[PDB]
Amino acid sequence: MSSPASWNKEDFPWSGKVKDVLQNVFKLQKFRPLQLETINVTMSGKEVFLVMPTGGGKSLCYQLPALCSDGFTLVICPLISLMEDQLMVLKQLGISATMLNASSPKEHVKWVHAEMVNKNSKLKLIYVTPEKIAKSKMFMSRLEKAYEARRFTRIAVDEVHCCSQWGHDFRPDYKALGILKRQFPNASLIGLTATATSHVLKDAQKILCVEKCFTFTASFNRPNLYYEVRQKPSNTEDFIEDIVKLINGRYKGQSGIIYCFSQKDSEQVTISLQKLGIPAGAYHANMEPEDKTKVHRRWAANEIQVVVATVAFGMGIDKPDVRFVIHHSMSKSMENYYQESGRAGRDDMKADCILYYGFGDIFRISSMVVMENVGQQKLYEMVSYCQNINKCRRVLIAQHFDEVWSPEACNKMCDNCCKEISFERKNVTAYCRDLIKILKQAEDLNEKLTPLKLIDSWMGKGASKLRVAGLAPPTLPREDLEKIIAHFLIQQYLKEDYSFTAYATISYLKVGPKANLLNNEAHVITMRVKK
Amino acid sequence: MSSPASWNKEDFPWSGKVKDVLQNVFKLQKFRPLQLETINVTMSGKEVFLVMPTGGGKSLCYQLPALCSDGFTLVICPLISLMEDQLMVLKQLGISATMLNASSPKEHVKWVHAEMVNKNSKLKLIYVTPEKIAKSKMFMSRLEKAYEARRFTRIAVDEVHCCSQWGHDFRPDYKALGILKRQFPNASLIGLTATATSHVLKDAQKILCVEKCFTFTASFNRPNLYYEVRQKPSNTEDFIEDIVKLINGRYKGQSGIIYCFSQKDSEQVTISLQKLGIPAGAYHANMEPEDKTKVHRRWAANEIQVVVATVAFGMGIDKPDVRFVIHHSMSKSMENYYQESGRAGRDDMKADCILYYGFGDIFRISSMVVMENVGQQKLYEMVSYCQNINKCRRVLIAQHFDEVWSPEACNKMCDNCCKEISFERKNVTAYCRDLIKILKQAEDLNEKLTPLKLIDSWMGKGASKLRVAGLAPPTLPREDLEKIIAHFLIQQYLKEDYSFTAYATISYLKVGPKANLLNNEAHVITMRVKK
DNA sequence: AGGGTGGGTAGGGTGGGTTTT
DNA sequence: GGGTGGGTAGGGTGGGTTT
Ligand SMILES: [K+]
Ligand SMILES: [K+]
Ligand SMILES: [K+]
Ligand SMILES: [K+]
Ligand SMILES: [K+]
Ligand SMILES: [K+]
Ligand SMILES: [Mg+2]
Ligand SMILES: [Mg+2]
Ligand SMILES: [Zn+2]
Ligand SMILES: [Zn+2]
């Protein structure tokens, strides 16, 4: 990836107009990181790819150069729902922009074809779906005449990861986008994406066959976010009492988001928050757009303070004043938590990202990812983040962002960097060998053990048939033992076994593959605990 | 890829039943290459991947091992249309096999669930779509019960390339198949595909979590095939006259296939064969499936001695006695020609694969391949194959199948190996310098040159506005002028320019990027012609 | 929006228990 | 069907091009 330091300057001939346009029509004071760098590249008539997290400010990077240059700027966008969002703010700001898709009516298409060749037109941005390029000979005909007339001057490829079959949401219609610049060379092209893997970019650069393209990446770090992991209470009705105590005590009157695992959690937390005086909402997949668009308005217009949903929020209008993102259960992966929690504090003021870590959540979510090839493995990354108490939460998230994460320091903006004066590391081998005793007795008695059943027999609870006749209880609180077993699960000394039935996939605990290392007398397993 | 030499033996303990089941139940005489090798690996309880060309006989490699083992063998298949084709052959040989999909009737699922646990069941093969694994908790429950009862013993994954997001026709449900051996470890799995690229295969091994896996590839070479390229006549009436004299002269009474470029050509060649006494074929994409299944029966029962089909003549075509594959125009790529022409001579007797090369075809196909990644580059591979007159056609086909093509010799069954003539190299610079003078004069007058307009002005015909006022005609046949210009097009001394209009993609010829090398008086471009 | 000693051969998966198109 | 018949104009579900 190229170095953008040499482009963060305001001495170009267009710098006078870009700074003018930035403040008076877009109503923004300064540039976000790499906004100025990328804008300088497009106005100089060269190719640029921009990697920036969702909500980073990618929309401005091709809207602004259109307003200080002539013609329209063509924006390739994968979805109509996203294109309508862009038109709502562009037409709000007094900028003339329109959109074209397969569903556009007959009367509307005639009006835009008219404006695409009128030199006296005010149209500066024309959004189209990739079908309008590959599967429309007519639109390609009008682009050809507009290019000959110097009316088609810039190209914008939003969500450029769809070019590569390596990147998520690969569209076969998106691979055709290489045809634009080969026949329209004088028009600059810009690519935008949230996916950071470099090899997907280079494949997009080959399909979008300009190899000599500058590639800028913004710092995926959000310094105004505070990350924290709290233990999830065993009793649910006591937990939701603790939620209101935190909302009222910390975030009184400020809007936020609550992420839950399942749809039944999303609704039950909503109505149980409303009864306690917190205006809540649900955003989980089904109902009628009309009856789950109101909740968007009610949250934007602040009739409701929190939106308790399951994961499909996708809610940036930049939602600028989001002060807190509390998770009821952990997200499926680290790339899911960063995306979901990263929607807070878009005003760059201090916002909180709170994750509630529950031992029961590990196995219910693990049971459902068994059809994602790396599902449990991505989940264990999230669980490792939860049980980790000694490292900066920002550094744990950074391990998934190798190419796009800058080394900027936490500066005491995580749970672990303020609290937690120094540690000690203790041996936990005997507890691991103890757990094998209950699992080996279960194999002898043809009994299968749920995670709950394993703790019970360990403590001296549950079926006496499952008890180890001479094994003594560990004399530790149940919250510590739920963190001991999960460590053995992450460390692969214990493994998850799944049983498929008609209703659901239920997770059991069985002896792990690394338990044979305990036959070695010199083997030692350790955990980092508090001294 | 692993070496199957140590496995090409019939002295294993199960070999007594293999020879019996192969000849007495499947009613076939001899194993095809790698059929015996792969079966020996499966019967030893080891996972194996088999790469074999389409129509090579990979289907037998999991049908036979089911008959020598207890219980059924589970076959993962991507399409209902493919499973129905196999079940027809399964029913006629007297082996009980069934299939399951989302459209299966409520009565049918209740019957198969019963057989999946009946120790006295006759069922030996159970075909399912990937939805029955990923999106069916109930079928997974019964697969789970069948595994404990030792009735579920083998796993078959047909079209395994769909697991990888790199391979064509990718299904997201195929990435979930990693659960099969993850939860059914004692059951062996076999993977099958027609795509040979190694990175897709290694991805499939990780997707289904078998890193320890044998990988066999069959020789994509078909020695019984004769490859030939003939020049296409200018008049379409004389071409069909030359086609009929080929069927009558060489291929009297035996069935074959004719592939055409366009849908209009398929129906025009059809009716022109009927009037000349040739039993027609009519294969297209837009007619009712009733018609699609008709042309198969009349072709299978030899009521028609040809199916003059378009691209996608519809493989699961399994007709062994196809003695000729005449192409009316060239295929889109080399990977497409091998697939289309390879459907001849499955009885291992000498069949001909003849391609007709037309100068007008180069640009008609170019207009449809310039809209998708890379194919115009793939199209030039075919044109290079056509104009090549000194190299074995088997070597030209081999260059696209590097990893899976054995160096076994042609033995004089291709167009270039029987011509027995060789030639020196002649200079063609003046003709290239001549063509540039006409292309630059057209650009000065703001006129664009079609391929036809370029030939006319060169010969001294066509519009006088386009003549050079000198540059007296080359006095060579138009057949030479077509192959000289196309050679300059491959060598990039000429390039294709496209104009998009409301009805068509029109290809034009313009000065190429390598024309600047002709400013050097020492530059020489040469062509090989016949001596 | 139930629980798994209530059962999965006659109870079935659109009856319900687990997130995006 | 043909492109000097035209595309600020007639529209592409009217037809000239691959599953
Ligand atoms: K039930
Ligand atoms: K027309
Ligand atoms: K029930
Ligand atoms: K019931
Ligand atoms: K017309
Ligand atoms: K007309
Ligand atoms: Mg965006
Ligand atoms: Mg097959
Ligand atoms: Zn920190
Ligand atoms: Zn040869």
DSSP per-residue letters across B22-43: HHHTS---SPPTTHHHHHHHHH
Query: CA–CA separation, A307 vs A341, rounded Å?
Result: 13
Query: Is A174 in the same domain as A147?
Result: yes
Query: Residue ranges of A for the binding site?
Result: 30, 32, 35, 55, 57-59, 392, 410, 414, 417
Query: CA–CA separation, A508 vs A504, rounded Å?
Result: 13
Strand C interface, protein residues by Cβ within 7 Å: A 169, 261-264, 284-285, 310-312, 314, 364, 367-368, 501-506; B 106, 109-110, 114, 117, 138, 145, 172
Residue B139, CB-side half-sphere exposure with 13 Å CA sphere: 22
Residue A127, CB-side half-sphere exposure with 13 Å CA sphere: 23
Query: CA–CA separation, B247 vs B253, rounded Å?
Result: 8
Tell me which residue of B222, B451, B236 sits closest to B328, measured CA to CA. B236
User: Residue A500 is nearest to which of B141, B170, B176, comparing CB atoms?
Assistant: B141
Place of tokens 């792990």: A512
Query: Residue ranges of A for the binding site for ADP?
Result: 30, 32, 35, 55, 57-59
Tell me which residue of A138, A316, A195 sits closest to B501, measured CA to CA. A138
In a 3-state reduction of DSSP, which class is residue B466? helix
Contacts of residue A394, Cβ cutoff 8 Å, sequence gap at least 6: A221, A227, A410, A413, A414
In a 3-state reduction of DSSP, which class is residue B330? coil
Query: Is A313 in the same domain as A392?
Result: yes
Per CB-CB distance under 8 Å, the chain B contacts of A179 are: 370-371
Residue of B nearest to A140 (CA): B500
Query: CA–CA separation, A359 vs A330, rounded Å?
Result: 10
Query: Is A158 in the same domain as A284?
Result: no
β-strands B526-527, B426-427: how paired? antiparallel
Mutation to test the A interface, candidates B179, B184, B374, B506, most A Cβ within 10 Å: B179
The gap between B114 CA and C9 C1' (Å) is: 8
Strands (E), B316-421: 324-327, 351-357
User: Tell me, what DSSP letter sits at residue A450?
Assistant: -
Contact: B371, A175; criterion CB under 8 Å:
no
Place of tokens 């498929």: A500
Please give the structure tokens belonging to residue A88: 């709502």
Contacts of residue B275, Cβ cutoff 8 Å, sequence gap at least 6: none
User: Residue B144 is nearest to which of A140, A371, A499, comparing CB atoms?
Assistant: A499
Q: Which positions 354-393 of B are in contact with A (Cβ < 8 Å)?
A: 370-373
Whether chain A has a CB inside 8 Å of the CB on B141: the answer is: yes
User: Tell me, what DSSP letter sits at residue A520?
Assistant: S
CA of B503 to the centre of ligand 5 (A): 10
Q: What sign does the dihedral B368-B373-B374-B378 (CA atoms) show? A: negative
What's the first-to-final CA gap in chain B, in angstroms?
Answer: 44
- Helical pair A451-459 and A478-490, crossing angle rounded to 10 deg: 130
Query: CA–CA separation, B476 vs A505, rounded Å?
Result: 76
Burial status of residue B460 (CB atoms within 10 A of its CB: 0-12, 13-18, 19 or more):
middle
CA of B145 to the centre of ligand 1 (A): 16
Please give the structure tokens belonging to residue B56: 């090579």
User: Tell me, what DSSP letter sits at residue B150?
Assistant: T
Query: Is B417 in the same domain as B434?
Result: no
Q: Are B95 and B127 in contact (CB under 8 A)?
A: no
Cα of B120 vs its chain's centroid, Å: 43
User: Which nucleotides of strand C are protein-proximal, with an atom < 7 A from a CB?
Assistant: 1, 3-4, 8-10, 12-13, 16-21
Contact: B137, A504; criterion CB under 8 Å:
yes
Query: CA–CA separation, A256 vs A487, rounded Å?
Result: 32
Q: Are A8 and A220 in contact (CB under 8 A)?
A: no
Burial status of residue B241 (CB atoms within 10 A of its CB: 0-12, 13-18, 19 or more):
middle
Query: CA–CA separation, B262 vs B328, rounded Å?
Result: 10
Contacts of residue A83, Cβ cutoff 8 Å, sequence gap at least 6: A75, A77, A99, A101, A127, A129
The one-letter code for the residue type at B293 is: T
Q: Are B308 and B298 in contact (CB under 8 A)?
A: no
Query: CA–CA separation, B183 vs A499, rounded Å?
Result: 9
Number of domains forming the structure of chain A: 3
Tell me which residue of B402, B502, B12, B2 sits closest to B215, measured CA to CA. B2
What's the first-to-final CA gap in chain A, in angstroms?
Answer: 44
User: Tell me, what DSSP letter sits at residue B369?
Assistant: H
Query: CA–CA separation, B440 vs B438, rounded Å?
Result: 6
The one-letter code for the residue type at B263 is: Q
Query: Is A400 in the same domain as A295?
Result: yes
Tell me which residue of A249, B457, A224 sits closest to A241, measured CA to CA. A249
Choose the final residue of a domain: A423, A446, A474: A423
Contact: B499, A144; criterion CB under 8 Å:
yes
| Active-site residue flag, B58 | yes
C11 nearest neighbour residue (CA to C1'): B110
User: Tell me, what DSSP letter sits at residue A148?
Assistant: H
D7 nearest neighbour residue (CA to C1'): B502
Contacts of residue A121, Cβ cutoff 8 Å, sequence gap at least 6: A96, A115
Long-range contacts of B58-63 (CB under 8 A, 24+ apart): B58/B158, B58/B192, B58/B194, B59/B86, B59/B158, B60/B26, B60/B32, B60/B35, B61/B35, B61/B190, B61/B192, B62/B154, B62/B156, B62/B158, B62/B190, B62/B192, B63/B26, B63/B90, B63/B95, B63/B125
Query: Is A247 in the same domain as A143?
Result: no
Query: CA–CA separation, A312 vs A38, rounded Å?
Result: 30
Which residues are paired to A128 by β-bridges? A76, A100
Q: Where are the alpha helices (DSSP H) in A59-101?
A: 60-67, 80-90
Please count the other Cβ atoms lying within 10 Å of the Cβ belonging to residue B182. Answer: 14
Q: What sign does the dihedral A267-A272-A273-A279 (CA atoms) show? A: positive
SS (HEC) of B255-313: CEEEEECCHHHHHHHHHHHHHCCCCCCCECCCCCHHHHHHHHHHHHCCCCCEEEEECCC
Cα of A421 vs its chain's centroid, Å: 32
Query: CA–CA separation, A91 vs A98, rounded Å?
Result: 9
D19 nearest neighbour residue (CA to C1'): B312
Query: Is A419 in the same domain as A429?
Result: no
CA distance readout (Å), A222 to A54, A238, A408: 12, 32, 10
CA distance readout (Å), B139 to A287, A388, A502: 29, 39, 8
Query: Is A138 in the same domain as A245?
Result: no
Contacts of residue B65, Cβ cutoff 8 Å, sequence gap at least 6: B39, B42, B43, B73, B154
3-state helix, strand, coil in chain B (%, to 5): 45, 15, 40
Give the CATH number for residue B491: 1.10.10.10
Choose the final residue of a domain: A375, A408, A423: A423
The gap between A520 CA and D5 C1' (Å) is: 91
User: Tell me, what DSSP letter sits at residue A471?
Assistant: P
User: Residue A505 is nearest to which of B137, B370, B371, comparing CB atoms?
Assistant: B137
Choose the final residue of a domain: A423, A453, A476: A423
SS (HEC) of A211-259: CCCEEEECCCCCCCEEEEEEECCCCHHHHHHHHHHHHHHHCCCCCEEEE
Residue of A nearest to B136 (CA): A502
Mutation to test the A interface, candidates B116, B195, B370, B372, most A Cβ within 10 Å: B372
Tell me which residue of A353, A355, A423, A416 sits closest to A388, measured CA to CA. A416
Query: CA–CA separation, A85 vs A90, rounded Å?
Result: 9
Query: CA–CA separation, A453 vs A3, rounded Å?
Result: 56
Place of tokens 């690519």: A191
Tell me which residue of A336, A342, A345 sits closest to A255, measured CA to CA. A345
User: Residue B138 is nearest to which of A140, A372, A502, comparing CB atoms?
Assistant: A502
C17 nearest neighbour residue (CA to C1'): A503
Query: CA–CA separation, B399 vs B343, rounded Å?
Result: 20
Query: CA–CA separation, B247 vs B293, rounded Å?
Result: 24
In a 3-state reduction of DSSP, which class is residue A414? strand
Query: Is A395 in the same domain as A434?
Result: no
Place of tokens 């499909």: A312
Residue B47, CB-side half-sphere exposure with 13 Å CA sphere: 22
Please give the structure tokens belonging to residue B277: 């006494």
The gap between A167 CA and C21 C1' (Å) is: 16
Query: CA–CA separation, A191 vs A154, rounded Å?
Result: 12
Closest Cα in chain B, distance from residue A373 (Å)? 6
User: Tell me, what DSSP letter sits at residue B174?
Assistant: G
Give the CATH number for residue A276: 3.40.50.300
Contact: B170, A165; criterion CB under 8 Å:
yes
In which domain, by residue range, is A236 found?
225-423
Query: CA–CA separation, A138 vs A153, rounded Å?
Result: 19
The gap between B332 CA and C14 C1' (Å) is: 46
Place of tokens 């990718």: B170
User: Residue B175 is nearest to which of A137, A178, A373, comparing CB atoms?
Assistant: A373
Please count the other Cβ atoms lying within 10 Å of the Cβ belonging to residue A336. Answer: 16
Contact: A179, B370; criterion CB under 8 Å:
yes
Query: Is A285 in the same domain as A429?
Result: no
Place of tokens 């668009």: A293
SS (HEC) of B107-124: HHHHHHHHHCCCCCCCCC
In a 3-state reduction of DSSP, which class is residue A301? coil
Query: Is A49 in the same domain as A188?
Result: yes
- Among the listed residues B9, B17, B19, B58, the single catalytic one is B58
In a 3-state reduction of DSSP, which class is residue B377? helix
Please give the structure tokens belonging to residue A47: 């190719």
Q: Mark A467-503 as b/e (b = at least 16 C-beta within 10 Å).
A: beeeeeebeeeeeebbbbbbbbbebebbbbebebeee
Please count the other Cβ atoms lying within 10 Å of the Cβ belonging to residue A272. Answer: 18
Contacts of residue A444, Cβ cutoff 8 Å, sequence gap at least 6: none
Please give the structure tokens belonging to residue B427: 């200079």
Burial status of residue A514 (CB atoms within 10 A of its CB: 0-12, 13-18, 19 or more):
middle
Query: Is A163 in the same domain as A262?
Result: no
Closest Cα in chain A, distance from residue B103 (Å)? 19
Per CB-CB distance under 8 Å, the chain A contacts of B137 are: 500-505
Structural resolution in Å: 3.2
- Helical pair A429-444 and A451-459, crossing angle rounded to 10 deg: 110
Place of tokens 């390609």: A140
CA of A141 to the centre of ligand 6 (A): 19
Per CB-CB distance under 8 Å, the chain B contacts of A175 are: 372-373
Query: CA–CA separation, B91 vs B13, rounded Å?
Result: 28
SS (HEC) of A500-511: ECCCCEEEEEEE
Q: Are B153 and B70 in contact (CB under 8 A)?
A: yes
CA of A60 to the centre of ligand 7 (A): 10
